[PDB]
Structure formats: C-alpha cells, structure tokens
Amino acid sequence: SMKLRVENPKKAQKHFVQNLNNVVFTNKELEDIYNLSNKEETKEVLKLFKLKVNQFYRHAFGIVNDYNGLLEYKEIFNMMFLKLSVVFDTQRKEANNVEQIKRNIAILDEIMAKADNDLSYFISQNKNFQELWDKAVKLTKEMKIKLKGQKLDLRDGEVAINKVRELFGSDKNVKELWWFRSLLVKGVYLIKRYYEGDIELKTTSDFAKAVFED
Amino acid sequence: GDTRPRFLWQLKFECHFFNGTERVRLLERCIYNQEESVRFDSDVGEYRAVTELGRPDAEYWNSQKDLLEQRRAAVDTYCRHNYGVGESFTVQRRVEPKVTVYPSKTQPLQHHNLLVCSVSGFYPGSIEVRWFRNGQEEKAGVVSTGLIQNGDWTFQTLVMLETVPRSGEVYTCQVEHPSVTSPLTVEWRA
Amino acid sequence: KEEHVIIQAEFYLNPDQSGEFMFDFDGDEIFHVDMAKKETVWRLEEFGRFASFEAQGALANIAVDKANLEIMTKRSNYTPITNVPPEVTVLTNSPVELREPNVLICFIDKFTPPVVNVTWLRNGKPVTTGVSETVFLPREDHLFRKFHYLPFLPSTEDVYDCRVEHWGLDEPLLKHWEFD
C-alpha cells in the first residue's frame, strides 16, 4: 500500500523519549564544537563534518515534515538528536583527529539510516496511519487535476486553504485531522509549482514523490 | 587534579538461569551513583521504586501497557535468546587446568615449610584440589588463595600444604575439573 | 540454586561524558561497544566468529542514558557520587620461571566512579608495548572491577609495579612485584 523508506524494516523499540523539549543544538552550540577543530591539518575534514551536521538537521526535520501525522515521529526525531549528542562527546575529545572526525561522519550517516528504518517499522505497525497518508495522496492527485485551469494566487497564503476547504472541506478527515488537512494544503503549493514547470518536485519529499509519481 | 563532582547513571539487565533455562528470572535495575532507585523484577511483573527517587519512574513506566508486556516476555525474547546465542563458547567453554608443584618457605627464616600446588589457566572456575601424603588425604594443614578470576575467561588458584616434607614421603596434588574425566595429579618426592 | 548470569550493563558519567555498553557472563566480559568508533569488540576474537551484535543499538541506549543522567542529577538536587578507592593487587598468570614468557595481572577492585589512571613501571620506567586492559566490569554492589595486563620475560633483575590513580585515593597507589 504505502511505500516505506525501508521496505522490510527491522524491529525498532521506543525508549519513550518523545516528550523531550530541547534536543536540537543551537548555532552557538554547534559553533563552539566546530571551534575545537582549530588545527590547520584538520580544516579540510572539518568542512565535511559541518556539511554532515547540516545534512543531519535537514534529514531530521524532513521526517517531521512528511510524517508529523504519525505519533511515533517525535520518538524518532528525538532519538536522532540524543544519538548526535553522543557522537559530539567523542568529537569534543577528538577535535583534531581526522580519522575520528571521519568515523563520526560515517556514524551520523548510520544514525540517519537507522532513523529511516525505525520510521518504516513504526509506519508498518500503524495500518491506520497508512490508510490516512495514502488517502491524502489520493486527494492531492485529484486536486492536481481539479485545479487544472484555476487561478492560483497563493501570494498571501490564503487561497490554498480555501481551495482545500472548497474541494474537500466536507471530508471527515479534513475537518478532524490538522495534519491531514495540512498535507493537502501543502499539496496545492506543490501542484502550483508543478504547473509552472517545476521539475524537482519528486525529490522534494516522500509526499511530493508519492504524489507526482505517475 | 580534577576536583569536580561526578554523577553516575547505571542500568543493568540481569538474566538469572537455573537448571539450563528451565527457570529464568530477569532483573532490570537503575542505579544513580551507587544506589538502586527503580527496578523490574520478572517475578513481580512490573516496576517498583526501591528508593523515593524511583517512584516517578516506576509510576510512569508501569502505565505503559505495551512496555510491561514486552518486559514480561523479555524472559524469553531476551534472556533465553541470548543464552542460546552464546551457549557454545560460554556455558560449554572448557579449558584444562595447568597443575605444577613447587616448594616454598612460610618465612624468610623458615625452612622448606609448605609445598605449593599451582592450578592455572582453567575454565570454568569450579574445581577441586586435594593434597595426599602417601595415599592418605591431607586437610588439616592446607591454605589457599581461594578461586581467582583472571578477567580473560580463565581462573587460577594456589593451594598450599603446611608440612616440612620428610625424606621418603611422596606428596600428591590431585585436581578435579570439568575439562578432564580423570583427576590430574602431580607428585613431589621428598 | 542459580547456574548462570548474563548481565547487560551500561553507564554514563558526568562531567567526563564517558559511557559504556557491555555484556557480562558469569563475571567475564563477552564483549562491549567502543563508543568512539561505535563498534562491537569481543573479549576473545573467537567469540566474534560465532556471534554478533548491532553496535548501533548500544549507541541508542547510551544516548538515552545520557539524557537520564541529567534528569536524575537534577531530581537528586545535584547529589555527587562518593568516591570509593580501589583495592589494587598484582600477580602473575602462572608460576614464574626465568626467561619463560608470562603475564602480569593488575586487579583494580571495588571502586567508583568508573575513572582510573593505570601505569606499568619496570625499574622506574613506564612500560607499554604489550599492555592491554579490560573495560570497566560491573559488581553486584554497583562498584567496578578492571584488569590491566603486561606480558613479560621473568628476570632476576627487574622490579615492576602497577600504579593506580583514583579520586578516592590520597596518593597514587603503587603495588610492587619482582618474583619476590
């Protein structure tokens, strides 16, 4: 039914860490870490490290952006940062060890992969979420057609919501679930971009991919 | 040099096995610094605070039905599972002891007072070692270091006999251990 | 009447920011996960040829542990741990014999927190080549054990000693050894 980021997810366990509130590192925080890598010889790998920390952040928020409707997403998001925090422990005591900085980078990747697995696992165990997430794609695809010749002036970010209320504002799921209605509101901005000839859409998110894929 | 206060958090999951895996008991405990606060005893079926500081945790976890069922099944999915994984090189691990006998002086002034029976590099730690003076078992004058675990999956122990070996006598150190069907022996002619 | 015990023990210590994930069987270490490299290391190579473990899982656990340590420290109103000095002892692997390869074992027992500096000395000179050590092993009283090793060639002209430094000690503890 719904495509997972990992087809056959390996068992995942929750540590009940969804209620943490400040897992994400601030810039000053990250900078104070980058600063430890003060030696010359390590300045090249320090770039690859900063680049990975960024890819990391984008990855994490990417998950909440696509799956905020899935209860277990806070668990996955928070775990990612709790793990990052451990890697940073090593980074702080190995600030100029290029081989270590490279291992850490490799681990930051592994942490992301694990996140995708675990996410796929929790999704597989929540058939209901799947039905809802698929239905959201279903209607966004219909909306892709429905708005074929209409005027979409989304400049003030007001029309999108109206259109969703106009075409599906009576759908039980669009009234009751904010996340579901949002996937559709998010969808019309995508459709708009599609019409303007945007070609990267499918790479924008799992949702965008599921929507604009055939 | 470092005079800063430290704070320690430990978590231990103990699997206790009896008669193979007939009876298993899981003990999950949380330790702050040097004091257990909360724990899950499979014999109980749910979290119980051990100190005041544990209460919040015992209360919170216990309200998670999914979590409790897991822990309750852990005895099988975790304990018995892991027990199998390593059985061949742990429970079955057998390393024959190396027995040798050499004299020694109880004091720098004393004569060749005691004989030492060195039993080393064996595993499991369960072993038996007895002294015999001309076929007759000796007990009254034995002293030992007790069983010693080396930390590399092997044990060693020293068993001494406090007797000035008179000429003519043949002392014998007999070692019995799982790694060998017939007891090991080392004689020492007076 | 219990026959065996398999213990999964992990810890996180502040402000050092040092953690440990290990499996224990009847007192001996089966393996542990090197936190820095995030990978399983077995106590005996042989073990790896028959079993495995996802180091990534340990990372997850130590990640949560860290967060818990903060929560507990605060909830306890920042109560620091009471240093308990180690009991050091040194003996050989097997009976010593001139020029016959042997090993020196330094047993550091009953202590906490899990932080300790160990140094091997031969006639006053710090020795290294050959040395090894086990990670921090857990005790039922919630204190720790640790072993350090020094392979050596016996000789009637060497005096070795294991130097152990721990916060619970007034001065560096220095246990001697020299065939005696």
């Binding site: 209620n19 | 975790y78 199998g84 | 495995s52 949560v64 909830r75």
Partner: peptide, 13 residues
C-alpha cells in the same frame, strides 16, 4: 546468532 538488547527507557518527564 545475534545478541539482542533491552532498550533503555527515558525517566519520568
């Protein structure tokens, strides 16, 4: 054979 672990749970709040 794969050694399996027990997940750590986050403390109260």
């Amino acid at each position: 054979p794969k050694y399996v672990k027990q997940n750590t749970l986050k403390l109260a709040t």
